[model samples]
Target: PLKVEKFATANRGNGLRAVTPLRPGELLFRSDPLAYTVCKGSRGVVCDRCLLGKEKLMRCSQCRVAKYCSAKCQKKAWPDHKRECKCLKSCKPRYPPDSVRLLGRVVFKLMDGAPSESEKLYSFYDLESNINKLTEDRKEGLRQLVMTFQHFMREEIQDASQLPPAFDLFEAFAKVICNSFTICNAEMQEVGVGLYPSISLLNHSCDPNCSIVFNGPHLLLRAVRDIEVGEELTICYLDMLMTSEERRKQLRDQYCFECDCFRCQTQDKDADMLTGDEQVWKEVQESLKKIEELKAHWKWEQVLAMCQAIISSNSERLPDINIYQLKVLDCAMDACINLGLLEEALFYGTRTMEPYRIFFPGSHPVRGVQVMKVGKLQLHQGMFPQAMKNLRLAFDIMRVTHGREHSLIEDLILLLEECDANIRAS
Candidate 1:
C-alpha cells in the first residue's frame, strides 16, 4: 500500500533527497500499518477482540472493540484480548497538548503504558486534552476536529440531526481528541494533522523540503524537491509563508514558541519584510496598510496599482518578487473580473494558487479552499470543466481532511452541485 523510494547519489541535498513529481494531478503515496496488532487499553483505533491485528478482525459488538474475523479470528485472538480488552473497558480518553514541547513531554512520558510493545511509542490520553484546550490561535482547528468526532459519534451511536450545543461538548470532545493522539518528534508542531510514529521522527527546519497529503486514514508525505542523503526533511509547521503578524501570533499561541527561523527572524528584524521598508530590512508598512484598506473596500484597480508600485519599489527584497504584496493583488484580480481586467485577474489568480499549494499541503484546509476559490473564478470566466475539476479535487481533499460529515463537506457538496448544473447547462 505504501512505496518507500530511496535517494541516489544524484539526488543530493539533505534528508529525503528523492522527489515525487506529479503532472498537475497524480497519485503519490499511501500509508501502511507498521504493525497491525490488537491491543488492550486502546482508546482511539484498535481491534477490541484480537489485540493481535485489526485489519483482519471484526469489531466488537459492544464497547466498540473486541473484534472478531468471522468468529474464527475472534476465537483465535481472544486469549490475548482477555486482559487488554478488560483494561480498555475501564479506560477513558484524555487531553491533547498545546505545544511541541508539551507533545514531546506527553509522548516521552506515556509510551510505557501503551498496550503492546509493537505499539509501545504512541499516546492518546493527552490528545483529547489538547483538543479541549483549543490553543488561542487554533480555534478553527479545534472546531474542525471536535466537530468531526461529534459527527462520527452521533452517526454511529446517536441521532445525526442533533447538533452539538457548545456546552455539552467538552467531555465527549476530550475523549475523541485522546483517541486521535499519536506521538512523533517534538518538532512537528506546525505540520497539520500529523500522527505519531509516522511524523514524530521528522526534525524541525525553517525551510522544509517535503510536503504531506492525506487519503482517508492515511497520511502521505512526499518530497517536493530532491534532497541529499541525511538531510532532515521537514514541512512548515505553521503558515510560515504568510507575510503577516497574524502568522507569528498563530505560532506563538498554538505552538507556544516564537519562530526563530531565517524568514521569521528576518521579518522581525525588519517589519519591512512584510511591508516594504528601505532601511536595511525595513520598508514602508504603509504600503501594506493601504493594500489592506483597498482589499477591505474592494477597490480592485487601486489595490492592483498599489501592489505593482510595491513590486517596482522593492523587487530585490520583496518576498517572491513582492508576491506577499500580491495577497491584495489576488483580491484585486478577483475584483478585476467586474472591473474588466480579465487578463490581470487570471494572472493573479494563477499566481496565488501556485505558491499557496507549494507552501501548504494538499491535506491542508487552506490550500484546498484557495484552490476552490480559484476554480470559482475560472467558472465565472466560462471554464466549466476546469472549474468542475478543481471543485472535485477540493471536495475530495476536504472529505479526507475534514471528514464526510464536516460542515465544510456540506459546503463543498453544494458547490459541486452548482458546478455540475452549470456544466450541464452550458
Candidate 2:
C-alpha cells in the first residue's frame, strides 16, 4: 500500500508516496474498479462479463445485446446487464461508445446506492472533475454528451427520480472517466476502462518508477524501479514512446498540467544524445515514422528490413534502453514472426529482452508475452529444454501479472505441459 500526501504542485494536487522501501517488480497494491464496462468494440468478440477474448460467445436470450463465454459469466454479469438490457433491446443493434457505456455504468451504480461499504476506502466524491480548468470547447463537448446520457437514462432506468443532479453528475463522471485507467489484456490491447479512485491518486511523470497491469478487472501497481521509503510513486499517463516535448504537450492539453519529471527537466538529453548530436536523434525519429507506415500496410519484410537498417545505423549512438530502439526491435520481432522467419524472430526477440527488462523492470505483460513468443518459436525449432525454461519464466510472470484465470495463463499451462510431454518422450 501507499501513503497519500497533499502536495501543492502545479499539476497534481495530491499524490501517493512509498510507505516502505520497495524493490523492483514488487506489487505495491491491487485495486478493483468502482465501476467498469467492456468497450463497445470488444463486446461481442470478448465476453461482456469477464472481458476474455473468445472465439465463440452465447448471446443473452432476451436482449441479445450482451455476449458471454459461458452460463457462469452470463450469470455474473446479469446484475449490471438487467437494467441496460431493455434500453439496448429498444435501441436495436446500436449501442453507445465504450466511454458512454462506462459513464452509464457509473450512473447505474450511483442510482443503486454507490459508495457502498465495500468501497469504503475511496468514494466517487473524492475524484477530481477539473471542470473549471477545462477549456470551453472541452466543456461544450461534455454538455453534448450530457444530453445524450440524459436521454439514455430516461429509457434505461424505470424511475428517473433516482438520478443525481444532471450537470453535476455529468461533470463528475466526465472528469473521473477522462482520468480513469485503461484496462488492457496481456497483449497490451485496450479492452475497457475502469475508475480506480485509489490508483488514480498516484501522480503522473514522463519517467515513472511504477507500471500498472491488469488481471481481469483487478489492477496491480507494481514497482518498475527501486524506490526509497519516502519516494513518491508515479505512473506515466501518456504514451512513453514519444519525446519529452510531445509528452509535456499531451499532459498539458489533456490533463491540464505540466510534467516536471527528471526526463522532462533534462529533456532526456543523456539518452537522446549518447552520440552528442541532434541530427542522429532526428534521423531515428524519421526512421520510426517510416517503420510505422510500413507496419500499417502489413509490409512485414519492409518493416524488418528498415528496422534492421536503423538498428545497424545507430548501433553505437542509440542506447540499448532507448524506447524508440526497443520499439524498432519489437516491430522487427513481430515482422519476423509473421513472415515465418522463426530464427530471425528469436534473434530479435532475444535482443529485446534486456532492454525490456531495463525499461520495465517490473513483470511487465509485454515482456511476458514476448517471452512466450520466443518460447513458442523455440519449441518450433525443437529446442525443448530452452523452450521449457523460457515458457516457465513467461508462465510465472504472466500468472502473477495477468492472473491465474486469464486465458494467457491457461495457454501457458498447456504449453508447459506440452514441453514436459516432449521431454519425457525424447
Candidate 3:
C-alpha cells in the first residue's frame, strides 16, 4: 500500500508523512509546477514549456521570449505563455530577474487565491513565509525585488490590487524565496526553477528518507529509503556531502535554523575540527579558491598538482568523508581525465564513490552518476571485470533514480553491453 498524508509535525512544523509502508524508489507523488521559468542563462537552450534543454528551440513569434521544443509544447504552454507574452514585450530592452518572472507568474495565479496545485491541499500563500526569519541583507534584497516586481508586473497588477488581499508582497516574496525548488536534471545540473509547494512540505534532514528528481517540469518525489507506516518523509535542504559544521552554518545562513536531525544530532565533533590549526584549513580553503580560478583557465596539470598537494598534506586532518577532500578529489579526477591520465582519474573517482554513497545514499542519481563515471574509467583502463561489476551497480541505481528514458541510462546500457561482450569473449 502506498499513501502519504500531511499533518503537523513536531518541531519541524508541517511535514508529509507516509501513512503506509513504502518501498524504495516508489513514487510518492509527482507535482506539476504551479509556475515555472527557465533561468535567464538557459533562455533558448532550455524549453520554456517542458524545461528540457536541447540546442534547437522555436522562439514564441510574438514576445520572442518563450522558447519551446515543438509546436506541441508551444500550444500547450500557450495558456501560461499568453499571460507572460504581453508583459514580456512591455518590459522590452529589459527582463526582470528569474525570481521576479516567477513571482509575477505566481502573482497572476494568486489573483485567484487558490492552490493551482492539483491536490489543492493549501494555497502556497498560506505556507510559512519566514519574513521575520530572513536575514537582514536578504530582507533588504527582497524589499528591492518588490520594487522590481511591482514595476515589472504593472501590466498585470495595473494599479493597487487576491493579488491576495492584504498580500504583504514581502511575505509572499519570502514564502516563495524560502519554498521554491531549484529544479535540477538527473545529473544534478540546475536547469530551471519551479514552485512545487507539495514537495516543499518535507522538512530538512541531513539524511533523508526520500529524493526529489525532475523530468521535464514535473517534480518526482521518490522514497530513497523504504519507509514504515507513520514515518515522516524528509529530504535535504542543502547538499549533505558537506561537513557537519559547514552544513549547519549554511542551514543557519539560508533557512535560518540549525539542523539537529539524526545525522547532525549525533554530534560530529570530528568535522568541526577539520584541522586543529584553523590557519591550515583556511590555507586549504584559499588553495581551493585558486583551484576554482585555475579550473576556469583549464590548467589541469596545475589543478592536479594542487589537488595532490591538498590530499597528501591534509590527509590526516581531513577524513575521507570530509567535503573538502571529496571536492579536491573531484577536481583531481576531472584534471586527470582532461590530462589523459585514465589511471589517476580512476583512482580519484573510485575514492569519491563510497563517500558519495554515504552522502547521497540509496538509489540516488548523484551516486549513480559517480558510480557510472568510475565504471567508465575502469573500462577505459582495461579493467573489464571491475567495470562490469560497478556498471551493473550503476545500472541498478540509475534505472530507478534516472528512469529508463534518461540519456545516462541509455549510455549506461551501452557500457554494460560492452562489458558483457568483453567478459564473454575472454
Write one digit per residue (lDDT tens) for candidate 2, span 30-113. Answer: 777777777655667678877777869999987787899999998978877777777677777667665666777777777774
Name the lDDT of candidate 1.
0.45
lDDT-sorted candidate list, best first: 3, 2, 1
Give candidate 2 misplaced runs (Cα > 4 Å).
Answer: 1-11, 113-118, 157-160, 165-167, 269-363, 385-426
Judged by lDDT against the true structure, how good is candidate 3? 0.77
For all candidates, what are the clash counts?
40, 0, 0
lDDT of 3 by residue, 157-182 (tens): 76656276777778777877767788
lDDT of 2: 0.72
Cand. 3 TM to true fold:
0.80
1 against 2, candidate with superior lDDT? 2
RMSD of each: 15.5, 5.6, 4.6
Task: Assess the local accuracy of residue 420 in candidate 2 as a C-alpha lDDT between 0 and 100.
Answer: 83
Q: Lowest-lDDT window of 10 residues in candidate 3?
A: 268-277
